[PDB]
Paper text:
Endoplasmic reticulum aminopeptidase 1 (ERAP1) cleaves the N-terminal amino acids of peptides, which can then bind onto major histocompatibility class I (MHC-I) molecules for presentation onto the cell surface, driving the activation of adaptive immune responses. Given that ERAP1-trimmed peptides modulate the adaptive immune response, controlling ERAP1 activity is an attractive strategy for cancer immunotherapy, autoimmune diseases and increasing immune responses against pathogens. Herein we describe the hit-to-lead optimization of a series of cyclohexyl acid ERAP1 inhibitors, found by X-ray crystallography to bind at an allosteric regulatory site. Binding of peptides to the regulatory site plays a critical role in determining ERAP1 substrate length requirements and the extent to which peptide trimming occurs through a “molecular ruler” mechanism.
Also discovered in the same high-throughput screen as the clerodane acid derivative was the hit cyclohexyl acid compound 1, which had ERAP1 inhibitory potency and a selectivity profile similar to those of the clerodane acid derivative. Hit compound 1 was found by X-ray crystallography to bind at the same regulatory site as the clerodane acid derivative. In this assay, compound 1 had an ERAP1 pIC50 value of 5.5. Three major binding interactions were observed from the carboxylic acid of compound 1 to Arg807, Lys685 and Tyr684. These key interactions are thought to be where the C-termini of endogenous peptides bind. The cyclohexane ring occupied a lipophilic pocket, and the attached amide did not clearly show any specific polar interactions with the protein. An additional hydrogen bond interaction was observed from the carbonyl of the thiomorpholinone motif with Gln881. Adjacent to the aromatic ring of the benzothiomorpholinone was a pocket containing lipophilic residues Phe674 and Leu677, shown to be occupied by a water molecule. The first area investigated was the substitution of the bicyclic motif, as the X-ray cocrystal structure indicated potential space for growth into the lipophilic pocket containing Phe674 and Leu677. Compound 1 had reduced structural complexity compared to the clerodane acid derivative and was therefore considered a more synthetically tractable molecule for hit-to-lead optimization.
Author numbering: 45 to 110, 116 to 485, 516 to 551, 558 to 940
Write the structure that this text describes.
Amino acid sequence: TPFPWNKIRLPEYVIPVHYDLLIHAQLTTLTFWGTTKVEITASQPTSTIILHSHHLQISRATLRKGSEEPLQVLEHPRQEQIALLAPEPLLVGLPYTVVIHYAGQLSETFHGFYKSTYRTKEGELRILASTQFEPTAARMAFPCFDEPAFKASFSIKIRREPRHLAISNMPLVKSVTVAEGLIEDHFDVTVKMSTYLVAFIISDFESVSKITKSGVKVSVYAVPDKINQADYALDAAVTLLEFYEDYFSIPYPLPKQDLAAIPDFQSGAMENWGLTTYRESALLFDAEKSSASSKLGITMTVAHELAHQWFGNLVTMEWWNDLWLNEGFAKFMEFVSVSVTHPELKVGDYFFGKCFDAMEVDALQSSHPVSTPVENPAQIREMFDDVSYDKGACILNMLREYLSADAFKSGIVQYLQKHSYKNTKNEDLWDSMASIDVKTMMNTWTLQKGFPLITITVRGRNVHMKQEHYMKDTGYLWHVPLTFITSKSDMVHRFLLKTKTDVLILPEEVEWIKFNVGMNGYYIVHYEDDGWDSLTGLLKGTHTAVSSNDRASLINNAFQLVSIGKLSIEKALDLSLYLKHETEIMPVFQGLNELIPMYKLMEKRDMNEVETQFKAFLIRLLRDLIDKQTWTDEGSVSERMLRSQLLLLACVHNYQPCVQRAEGYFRKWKESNGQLSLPVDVTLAVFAVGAQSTEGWDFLYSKYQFSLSSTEKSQIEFALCRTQNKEKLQWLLDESFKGDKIKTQEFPQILTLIGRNPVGYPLAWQFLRKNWNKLVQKFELGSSSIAHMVMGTTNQFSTRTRLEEVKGFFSSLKENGSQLRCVQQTIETIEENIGWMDKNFDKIRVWLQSEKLER
Ligand SMILES: O=C(CN1C(=O)CSc2ccccc21)NC1(C(=O)O)CCCCC1
Ligand SMILES: [Br-]
Ligand SMILES: [Br-]
Ligand SMILES: [Br-]
Ligand SMILES: [Br-]
Ligand SMILES: [Br-]
Ligand SMILES: [Zn+2]
């Protein structure tokens, strides 16, 4: 019989109410079986039930009316569906139960119901089984109506050996002994939720717990050897859940919240309702070895996953085209919450960096609107990108500054209350925010890609403003909430620009004007006539006349304008010279973010002399700030992050005072047999210098197997990827790909670091090409992991030959990668790199030879 349904989306006329899932995993044979019972009703007469199933071996399917009838099973593996045919049509509105018996193999990927492993201190391999369903992998563990708008309650039962613990979304009601060495755990019924949020883990994890003031038991789960690193996340999770409950005025509805650190995990974390899961590096904190960056990362990742309990779980997007309703909000709420719960982290100052990263992809033709259509699993996975997360958060921040925090908060509380246990579209959010023209304005920011360039022309008191789509002509127009300050006023002045152009009149003439105050708006600014000269003069003479975020926005925008010929490279580089006086993390890092990519392009070309001169200029520019750093872990989180990055930068570029100190610390660390406690903040620099020799690299690698510290593992991995030894770089690719000595969850990062190694970069792009099929099988087409490997190995090329290697390779893949959005993005980036280098290389050579810092 041919397949009776020819659409990717399921029919809307058969709706589930409740699922009873029985799962029995065998961790010795790596197999599982299940029985899924789903209560359904049909809104129209049908004899066919279409549902999702992927890589499950279905043995039997029956239909119970409320008698039992057998169902004929048909499969459509490409659509990832099964069709269950009943002997007679279902009666409308009457309850039926579909019962499906099946078996599967535990996935060897990081999705579905997959295998995870770890080693004990004695070298014994331990196996656990965990889940990762978002977006479409629930259908790999149980047959279901696997679309987020088909919400249902779930009663989960897990069969296991007595040596294992099982945890799931809800608390454990009871454990029944079925037979010898066979226990069945019954978990309480969940509230109405999407299939992608179902979770279960079978392991020998240990836990620590703490109860919130609202009575919620919060626990952190981890392997026995790492449960002593769970205290920080446990305390942070309790404080953040209490923050969100008080903030939203909507209690967390479940009796418990678990945070599990999984030894193998693809993304950073996942918000499964009641059972949030994390990479061990995103949750576990070692008070002696963890970095300030990693502590910030745990805090923000926990805040993100807990925000999703409201934004994503309680209220879910109707379809993946509106995935930003979940991810943009969760990303933005990390800042809203942590700014209050952990004020010592000063996160609010760092938000804007995400917006500049989103602008890098959003300035290309291959970007997409925040809300855009998706059909198949690879396209849906492509929605987990910088546009949904970072542009999503940045436009919400822009809107909050525009409406005020009070009006914005009222709109989001109304929205969550109105749509609790249901699904929403982009329009529902805008109607909630307008109930406090929001919809017209925010449609310009979510229903078309990109962002505007705002051009300012000052004629005495007359300030002319123009908008145009910034693209590296569509005729796009936005409702832009402009802000500005002047040399006469530091009040934030506002002007809503809804037309191509407008003009305003200043009360008095000014010496300078600066738009996008604190860079809270998702747009860039160009100043005509002497505007850039006036702003450059202000930064050179009195840089604290504007805030550190305003200084960072001027640096970023000046370099973005060079790409479209609005500002010469010489004038942008002249502006950057003020950084010799800068002390603040955001503008110092913004200077690095703009300048470092220039020598990354030179490293992949025969441009050694200008590359070396450019690197010497960068070190000279920040020399006073580098020399002021102590080689300790002293200071605030920003002082520590600034120290670590500056010392690492100085050492990799052979700045002699720092290389000598790093060389001495590494030699002493190796002499001590790795017992010397180095300051965590200098460890990246010390290890990167030490790995340059064969003996140093082998010694660093010998310590890797014993480490229980996520930071130490990450620091060693970074250092090992910096060697000039090509056999060692190849070995890291081969071993992390294999997953024994270095876990495969680190492969995408290792591949990108080697792709950025000045001598070993050809090896990363070659490895990706030669192992494409296995990498796609492990990480999936459309995944953020694949996108980071594609862009990480190719987006710093700047020759027509490299451009054609990329086009030729990906077009030869046909259905296994030729249509990837990351491929078009990297092709467009290489085209821009070719043009930028051709135009600016010798201009930079001449500018460097002028030695303006030495003048
Ligand atoms: O360049 C990189 C990585 N990287 C890029 O590949 C270009 S975008 C970028 C912007 C800011 C910071 C790092 C960036 N890392 C270092 C390098 O020269 O390879 C320099 C910094 C010390 C670590 C090594
Ligand atoms: Br049974
Ligand atoms: Br505003
Ligand atoms: Br005038
Ligand atoms: Br010191
Ligand atoms: Br090849
Ligand atoms: Zn998220």
